[PDB]
C-alpha cells in the first residue's frame, strides 16, 4: 500500500540521497527549465508533489503518473523508470 | 550499517523485485555468459555473493566491490551505479 507515512519515508531518502533524480523529474516530466533544485513534498498513488526552483522561480508542481500505484514497489519502479526515461531524452 | 539482517532485506527485495539487474551484474561484473537467471545470497561491505545459473549448471561467484561500503545507502548507490554501467556495456 501507499500511506502518508510510507510517502514521507520515501521523500526523506529521495531528498537526502537521490536529489538529482527529483530535478530530472521536474525537468522532463514537470516541464521546468534550468532546474537548480527540486524536493518531494508528498507521493500518493496517482502522483507526487515537487517543490522546484526553476525558470521564473520557486513553485509547487504536481507530476501525475500515467497509472495509479497499487503497492509501494510500484513507486520504486516508477522512480527508477522516470529516472531512466528522463536520462534517455537529454 | 550492513548486518546479515540488512543483507537479507536487500537480497530478498533484489531477488523478488529486480532480478533483471542481478543478472546484469552477473553478466558484466561476474564475467558470466548465457546467464539463465541470478539471485543475491548476501551483501557484505566488501562485495556481494550471487547464485548465477549458467546453462546446465549453477555456480556461486562473489563480486568484490571496488571500494568498501560504509552503510546501507552506499549499498543502494552501487546497485544503482552497476545497473547503469552494466546496460552501457552494450
Ligand atoms: C533495500 C531496499 C532497496 C533496494 C534493494 C533498492 C534497489 C535499487 C536498484 C537495484 C536500482 C537500480 C534500478 C535499475 O537500474 O533497474 C534502484 C534505483 C532507484 N531506487 Fe532503490 N532500492 C531500495 C529502496 C529505495 C527507496 C526506499 C527509494 C526511495 C524512497 C529508492 C529510490 C530509487 C530511485 C529513485 C532509483 C532510480 C535512481 C537513479 O536513476 O539514480 N530505492 N534501487
Ligand atoms: Zn524495488
Ligand atoms: Zn538510496
Would you kindly provide a written description of the structure presented here, covering whatever features stand out?
The PDB classes it as metal binding protein. Two copies of one chain form a homodimer. With 90 residues, chain A is an alpha+beta fold. The first copy, chain A, has one domain: Split barrel-like, CATH 3.20.180. In chain A, 46% of the residues lie in helices and 23% in strands. Chain A has a three-stranded antiparallel sheet. Chains A and B meet through α3 of A and α3 of B. The structure holds protoporphyrin IX containing FE (HEM) and zinc ion (2 copies). One zinc ion binds next to α1 of chain A. The site of one zinc ion (ZN) has 3 residues of chain A, from α1.
Can you tell me the CATH architecture of chain A? Alpha-Beta Barrel
Instruction: Report how far apart the termini of chain A are.
Output: 33 Å
Let me know the number of strands of chain A. 3
- Shape, principal axes of CA atoms of chain A: globular
The fold-level CATH name of chain A is Split barrel-like
CATH superfamily of chain A: PNP-oxidase-like
Which oligomeric form is depicted?
Answer: homodimer
Q: Structural class of chain A, please?
A: alpha+beta
- Element order, helices and strands of chain A? HHEEEH
Number of separate domains of chain A? 1
Largest interface: A-B, 5 and 4 residues
Small molecules bound in the structure, each named once: protoporphyrin IX containing FE, zinc ion
Q: How is the biggest beta sheet of chain A arranged? A: 3 strands, antiparallel
CATH domain class name of chain A: Alpha Beta
What is the percentage of strand-forming residues of chain A? Answer: 15-25%
Q: Strands of the biggest beta sheet of chain A: in what spatial order?
A: 1-2-3
Helix fraction bin of chain A? 40-55%
Number of helices of chain A: 3
Rg value of chain A: 12 Å
InterPro entries (chains A, B): DUF2470, Haem_oxidase_HugZ-like_sf
Binding site for Zn(2+) 1 (chains A, B): 13, 18, 66, 76
Organism (chains A, B): Synechocystis sp. (strain ATCC 27184 / PCC 6803 / Kazusa)
Binding site for heme 1 (chains A, B): 9, 18, 72
Amino acid at each position: 500500500p501507499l500511506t502518508p507515512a510510507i510517502s514521507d519515508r520515501i521523500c526523506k531518502h529521495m531528498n537526502e540521497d537521490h536529489a538529482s533524480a527529483i530535478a530530472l523529474y521536474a525537468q522532463v516530466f514537470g516541464q521546468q527549465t534550468d532546474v537548480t533544485m527540486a524536493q518531494m513534498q508528498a507521493i500518493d498513488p496517482t502522483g507526487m508533489d515537487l517543490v522546484v526552483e526553476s525558470e521564473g522561480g520557486s513553485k509547487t508542481i504536481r507530476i501525475e503518473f500515467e497509472q495509479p500505484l497499487k503497492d509501494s514497489e510500484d513507486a520504486h519502479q516508477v522512480l527508477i523508470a522516470m529516472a531512466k526515461q528522463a536520462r534517455s531524452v537529454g
